[PDB]
Automatic annotation (TrEMBL), chain A:
Gene Ontology biological process terms, A to Z: negative regulation of translational frameshifting; rescue of stalled ribosome
Record protein name field: Guanine nucleotide-binding protein beta subunit, putative
GO CC list: cytosol; nucleus
Matching SMART domains: WD40
Keywords per UniProt: Repeat, WD repeat
The keyword Repeat appears for this protein: yes
First and last residues of every WD repeat: 9-50, 56-97, 98-131, 186-226, 272-305
PROSITE patterns in the record: WD_REPEATS_1, WD_REPEATS_2, WD_REPEATS_REGION
Protein family according to the UniProt entry: Belongs to the WD repeat G protein beta family. Ribosomal protein RACK1 subfamily.
Gene3D superfamilies per the UniProt record, alphabetical: YVTN repeat-like/Quinoprotein amine dehydrogenase
GO MF: protein kinase C binding; ribosome binding; translation regulator activity
InterPro entries hit by this protein: RACK1-like, WD40/YVTN_repeat-like_dom_sf, WD40_PAC1, WD40_repeat_CS, WD40_repeat_dom_sf, WD40_rpt
Automatic annotation (TrEMBL), chain B:
Organism, scientific name: Trichomonas vaginalis (strain ATCC PRA-98 / G3)
Gene3D superfamilies registered for this protein in UniProt: 3.30.300.20, Ribosomal protein S3, C-terminal domain (3.30.1140.32)
Cellular compartments per GO CC: cytosolic small ribosomal subunit; nucleus
Name this polypeptide is given: 40S ribosomal protein S3
Superkingdom to which the source organism belongs: Eukaryota
Family listed: Belongs to the universal ribosomal protein uS3 family.
The entry's keywords: Ribonucleoprotein, Ribosomal protein, RNA-binding
Domain Small ribosomal subunit protein uS3 C-terminal: 103-185
Keyword RNA-binding annotated: yes
Automatic annotation (TrEMBL), chain C:
Every Small ribosomal subunit protein uS7 domain range: 33-186
PROSITE patterns hit by this protein: RIBOSOMAL_S7 (PS00052)
GO molecular function: mRNA binding; rRNA binding; structural constituent of ribosome
InterPro entries assigned to the protein according to its UniProt record, in alphabetical order: Ribosomal_uS7 (IPR000235), Ribosomal_uS7_CS (IPR020606), Ribosomal_uS7_dom (IPR023798), Ribosomal_uS7_dom_sf (IPR036823), Ribosomal_uS7_euk/arc (IPR005716)
Name of this chain's protein: 40s ribosomal protein S5-B, putative
UniProt GO BP: translation
Domain of life: Eukaryota
A GO CC term assigned to this protein in UniProt: cytosolic small ribosomal subunit
Keywords assigned by UniProt, alphabetized: Ribonucleoprotein, Ribosomal protein
Native organism taxonomy: Eukaryota, Metamonada, Parabasalia, Trichomonadida, Trichomonadidae
TrEMBL record, chain E:
Lineage: superkingdom: Eukaryota
Pfam families: Ribosomal_S19e (PF01090)
InterPro entries hit by this protein: Ribosomal_eS19 (IPR001266), Ribosomal_eS19_CS (IPR018277), WH-like_DNA-bd_sf (IPR036388), WH_DNA-bd_sf (IPR036390)
Name of the protein described by the UniProt record: Ribosomal protein S19e, putative
Any one Gene Ontology BP term: ribosomal small subunit assembly
GO cellular component: cytosolic small ribosomal subunit
SMART domains reported in the protein's UniProt record: Ribosomal_S19e (SM01413)
Length: 305, 208, 186, 133, 146, 97
RNA sequence: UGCAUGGCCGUUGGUGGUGCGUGGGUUGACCUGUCCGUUGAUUCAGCUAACGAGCGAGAUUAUCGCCAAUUAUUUACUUUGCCGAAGUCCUUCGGUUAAAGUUCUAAUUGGGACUCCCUGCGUAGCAGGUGGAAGAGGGUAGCAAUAACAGGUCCGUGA
């Protein structure tokens, strides 16, 4: 069902590229184009939802992507600067930078179990670092790489699956174990492949330039279903708990119910010859309570079902 | 035992005297500049010219007239001086060389049209983007009057003049009056040849 | 930001701008942002036209009183003189200086002037309070030159009579010539 | 806990240095009462009047003349207070707002520097004086 | 607000420079430290200066100032002090230049101070001795109480 | 062993940056441990017209002096090999301390 | 002898200008190309017997301003620790191949600003505003077309 405006809150002057939330609740971090990445903390008390907790001043360009420990201690973040930065959560202060990656770095994730840092950008390689900070594996691809995501859980032994979405069109999926052998490679999108996320269970995967959100299979490949968005969508992210999938267009956020197989809702809040704000990222909380979305003027808006 | 300033300036002042010297000796051999390598005890110099055979004739006597003239001037020790020669590939595009060809003609009473369009054709066919030739002074009349002969295209402004445009000024004394010769020659950039980078005017878009 | 007072003495709580009159007050520049502990500042006020409004008004006087050719620069001199006016103003009358100051800035600058026959144009409020501060400070140095008397006093003599609308003042005499010339030419 | 940041007008450069302490602010080797002016006393304290009883600041300077050396210190005090609250965020953004409400020079500084001298004239833009006839 | 120190009592750095230097001038006239020279008394402080000093006890207020300025720069030379106490040259039709002070007046003091042991000579300029910088923090607590 | 300084000087920066690369490169091979000085603008400001005619116009001729200092501990055997770049308008003073 | 000349420089004018290939117009000098808004600008936009290549403008070079990587304990400093002198319970000085560095200092490689963003006005662009170290060529210089002046210099020259 549809959901009302809970709270806008702002502390961030340029746009927001990405956004992520630490485990359970409290503490979300909005990576910002300003080159400064905040962390908040959530009161959820009437008028103010959150207030800002730290600022991470260190990079010399926009901060692309931001990724978090299971503890919510030792978060990592990357920029076009061509480096990454581990930042102690409590005292800020960079712990160690990363050096090796040539061009602007667009995508970061951890594993589930704090094992392998997965940086990626426009040198056409997914680097796999150690948590120590030294380069283990150097996987390869045709074009630039916008986005990555990691399969949940796996209990250590299971291969930890890495979906990737490219600038040319293609969508790579990889195993790890040790050597990292790609399960499948496919021409997932017609032109540009913007953003990639997993289904929580991880049978399926999500990618989608040509106004088409397409789910695919984790093993081996080929499509389950193809939807059609109204106008071209920048970020995609499935709900944790319930069977939803959601997609940040210009016109709103297109809320597919996956079984019923249709857009139930489209939520933009109200505000000649101007663009007016796009939404460039989504973030479901870990409970599936609340939906945060980061915006192009420099704001974040919360909605709760 | 010098300052850090003076070792630069002495070496500069060495080079400019050396280069004005080898205008006046190597007019016949066809001079095209030089490079000087300076060491506290060893000096190595590359002379560059067209007629490399004209040195080596008479079992290399012509170079040993020059080498003593350098040695006695600055009072350097032999063994510690080490001259070579290295040949000019493409004499067409070096400016000091092609100046001398236009100097060679106008002494021997060729018309100035024919003298320019000798060398201006020879420059362009050899491999260059443009060239200009000026012959300033007194032919025919009592007043002096300027010829300018140009082809191709010839960039006159900015930084990009200094990188691309070779040029060379001179003069011919005569029975009647003092003419001035002047030859500007623009180059094409090579891919890492012997300039590297293209002009800041041009850009190139890739094919899809 | 609770006291907030000039030279560490006077306060801006007073000065009743609404009370002073209608119009004129706006280009006055005594509205909160303008208040500062010391009138000295790193000015960036000559960049784009109307930015002179957003600076403090007491500073704008201290700049006018910077002439001629020997006193150029040396602002740090001028803000002593305007201090030692604002002692003489306050401790003689018992009004505080800033109230009786801004009344002087009202009534000096003439409405109208001969635009080069000659025709009598009206004025902007910006050009009034400009030609307030000139015709005060012009009179001060013209008086103080050769006069065996300190210019802090000769400012304070000019500045009191500007408020009370007397023809003692070099300001308020010189407007009634300039305003009558506009009335004559017309 | 300690933070080390600079101010800068014209060609002054004043570094300041926060610690934990007991409300001591010290220029060169001495309290910032002692600048001997009565204008420029009140100019350095504009940062502090708006807003440090935890903090202990220790300021050293070079460059500039008498005025611009003060305007570096107003930057170095105010920035070092703001840089302390940033490291050691809610309250930093609102106390920083009180300065930027007052005046922009306490954090930002100004990039203007003197124009080089040009030939044919005694300074930059002035030129000597013509004759004619 | 005002600058606040630790350390309870007062030191030579703390109290103000116009005040301190004159209290240290008085502290020689009572004690018979320094003395006046007897040859001098009519001499210009510097050749550039247009007249003798006004004060007649001027010798001591200079001799206080040099000990104050040995304190604040640790070392103090003669030629360094001579350059300091000079000024611009005022009279002539040309533009004005920095000329130096007299040496002899300043030398006379820095020998007279080394009689009562208030300044040793060392490497680089002269630097004040354990006896010396004690005498300043006598006068700092004299004028700190005041 | 007599910890030795190089001191590398040049007119032109591209010609310098070859020699710094080589003399840093060779301390990789020999394995000797390896430890920018401020550049001078020699401004000479001649009046550009020959005669006294015309408006007084002045060309400014900056010669530039880029200056770098590598230094390292090295045993006289190893240092003879490293010293021997040979570039146009570059100098290298060796200095024992 | 600069009114016999070379080079170099000032100036007309550092303004926005200059003129080729093929085509067309004219008996011809010659014209067209090189013409209702915009820009510092023959700058772009679009008209259109012209279409297409130039040169100058722009780009580029140099520096000033803001960034953080890369180095520096005998050529810059800072912090902490030691040993001094005073204070005399913790404050300030001076020294130190002694441990960690880089905010000041020094200088190389890159990042950064584009009318991108919003609102008015009229596609080219313009005015204001937010943010920003910096906003409208970011500031200041350097370089600077063709065509000439009987302007200057035979007292700069082994012109």
């Amino acid at each position: 069902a549809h959901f009302a405006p809970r709270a806008t809150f702002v502390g961030h002057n340029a746009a927001i590229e990405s956004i992520e939330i630490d485990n359970e609740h409290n503490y979300l971090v909005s990576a910002s184009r300003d080159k400064s990445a905040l962390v908040w903390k959530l009161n959820r008390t009437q008028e103010q939802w959150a207030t800002p907790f730290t600022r991470l001043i260190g990079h010399n360009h926009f901060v692309s992507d931001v990724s978090l420990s299971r503890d919510a201690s030792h978060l990592l973040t990357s920029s076009w600067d061509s480096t990454l930065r581990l930042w102690d959560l409590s005292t800020r202060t960079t712990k160690k930078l990363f050096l090796g990656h040539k061009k602007d770095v667009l995508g970061v994730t951890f594993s589930p179990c704090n094992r392998r840092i997965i940086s990626v950008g426009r040198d056409n390689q997914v680097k796999i670092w150690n948590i120590l900070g030294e380069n283990k594996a150097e996987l390869q691809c045709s074009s630039w790489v916008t986005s990555v995501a990691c399969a949940p859980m796996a209990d250590e032994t299971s291969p930890l699956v890495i979906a990737v979405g490219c600038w040319d069109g293609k969508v790579y999926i990889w195993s790890i174990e040790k050597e990292a052998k790609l399960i499948k490679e496919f021409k997932a999108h017609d032109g540009r492949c913007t953003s990639v996320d997993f289904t929580p269970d991880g049978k399926w995967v999500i990618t989608g330039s040509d106004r088409k959100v397409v789910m695919w299979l984790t093993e081996n490949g080929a499509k389950t279903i193809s939807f059609t968005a109204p106008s071209p969508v920048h970020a995609v992210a499935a709900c944790p708990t319930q069977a939803w999938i959601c997609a940040a267009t210009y016109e709103g956020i297109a809320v597919w119910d996956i079984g019923a197989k249709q857009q139930i809702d489209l939520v933009q809040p109200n505000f000649n010859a101007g663009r007016t704000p796009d939404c460039t990222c989504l973030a479901w909380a870990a409970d599936g309570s609340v939906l945060y979305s980061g915006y192009n003027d420099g704001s974040i808006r919360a909605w709760e079902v | 035992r010098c300052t850090k300033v003076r070792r630069i300036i002495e070496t500069g002042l060495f080079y400019a005297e050396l280069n004005e010297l080898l205008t006046r000796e190597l007019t016949k051999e066809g001079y095209g500049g030089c490079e000087v390598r300076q060491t506290p005890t060893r000096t190595e110099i590359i002379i560059k010219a067209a007629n490399t055979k004209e040195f080596v004739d008479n079992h290399g006597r012509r170079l040993q007239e020059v080498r003593m003239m350098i040695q006695k001037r600055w009072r350097l020790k032999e063994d510690s001086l080490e001259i070579f020669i290295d040949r000019i590939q493409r004499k067409g595009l070096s400016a000091l060389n092609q100046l001398e060809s236009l100097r060679y003609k106008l002494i021997a009473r060729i018309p100035a049209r024919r003298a320019a369009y000798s060398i201006i054709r020879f420059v362009m066919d050899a491999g260059a983007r443009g060239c200009e030739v000026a012959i300033s002074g007194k032919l025919r009349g009592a007043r002096a009057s300027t010829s300018k002969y140009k082809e191709g295209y010839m960039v006159k402004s900015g930084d990009v003049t200094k990188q691309f445009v070779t040029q060379a000024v001179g003069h011919i004394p005569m029975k009647q009056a003092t003419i001035g010769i002047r030859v500007l020659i623009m180059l094409a950039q090579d891919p890492s040849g012997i300039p590297k980078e293209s002009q800041p005017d041009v850009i190139k878009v890739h094919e899809a | 930001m609770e006291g907030v007072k000039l030279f560490g003495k006077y306060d801006y709580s007073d000065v009743d701008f609404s009370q002073l009159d209608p119009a004129l007050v706006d280009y006055i520049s005594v509205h909160e942002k303008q208040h500062v502990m010391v009138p000295h500042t790193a000015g960036r006020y000559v960049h784009k036209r109307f930015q002179k409004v957003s600076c403090p008004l007491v500073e704008r006087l201290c700049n006018h009183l910077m002439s001629r050719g020997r006193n150029t620069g040396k602002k740090l001199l001028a803000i002593r003189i305007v201090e030692h006016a604002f002692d003489i103003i306050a401790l003689s009358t018992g009004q505080n200086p800033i109230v009786t100051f801004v009344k002087g800035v009202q009534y000096c600058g003439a409405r109208e002037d001969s635009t080069r026959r000659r025709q009598a144009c009206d004025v902007s409020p910006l050009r009034r309070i400009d030609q307030a501060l000139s015709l005060i400070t012009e009179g001060v140095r013209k008086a103080a030159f050769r006069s065996s008397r300190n210019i802090a006093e000769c400012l304070a003599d000019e500045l009191i009579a500007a408020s009370n609308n007397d023809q003692t003042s070099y300001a308020c005499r010189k407007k009634d010539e300039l305003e009558r010339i506009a009335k004559s030419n017309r | 806990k300690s933070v080390q940041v600079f101010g800068r007008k014209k060609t002054a450069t004043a570094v300041a240095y926060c610690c934990e302490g007991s409300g001591l602010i010290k220029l060169n080797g001495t309290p910032i009462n002692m600048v001997s002016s009565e204008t420029l006393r009140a100019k350095i304290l504009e940062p502090l009047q708006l807003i440090w009883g935890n903090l202990d600041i220790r300021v050293r300077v070079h460059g500039g003349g008498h005025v611009a050396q003060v305007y570096a210190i107003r930057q170095a005090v105010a920035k070092a207070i703001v840089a302390y609250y940033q490291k050691y965020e809610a309250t930093k953004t609102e106390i920083k707002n009180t300065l930027l409400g007052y005046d922009r020079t306490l954090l930002v500084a100004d990039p203007r520097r003197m124009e080089p001298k040009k030939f044919g004239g005694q300074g930059a833009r002035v030129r000597r004086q013509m004759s004619y006839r | 607000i005002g600058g606040k120190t630790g350390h309870k009592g007062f030191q030579a750095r703390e109290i103000s420079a116009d005040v301190f230097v004159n209290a240290l001038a008085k502290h020689f006239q009572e004690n018979r430290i320094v003395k006046p020279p007897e040859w001098a008394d009519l001499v210009k402080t510097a050749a550039l200066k247009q007249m003798a000093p006004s004060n007649q006890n001027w010798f001591y207020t200079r001799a206080a100032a040099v000990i104050r300025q040995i304190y604040m720069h640790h070392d103090a030379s003669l030629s360094g002090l001579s350059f300091h106490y000079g000024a611009n040259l005022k009279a002539v039709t040309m533009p004005k230049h920095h000329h130096n002070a007299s040496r002899k007046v300043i030398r006379s003091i820095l020998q007279q101070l080394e009689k009562s042991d208030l300044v040793k000579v060392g490497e680089k300029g002269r630097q004040l001795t354990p006896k010396g910088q004690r005498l300043l923090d006598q006068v700092a607590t004299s004028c700190g109480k005041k | 062993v007599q910890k030795i300084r190089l001191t590398i000087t040049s007119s032109k920066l591209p010609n310098l940056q070859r020699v710094v690369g080589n003399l840093m490169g060779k301390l990789k091979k020999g394995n000797l441990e390896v430890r920018p000085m401020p550049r001078r603008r020699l401004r000479i400001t001649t009046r550009r017209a020959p005669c006294g005619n015309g408006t007084e116009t002045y060309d400014h001729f900056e010669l530039r002096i880029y200056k770098r200092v590598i230094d390292f501990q090295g045993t006289a055997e190893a240092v003879k090999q490293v010293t021997q770049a040979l570039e146009p308008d570059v100098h290298v003073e060796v200095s024992v301390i």
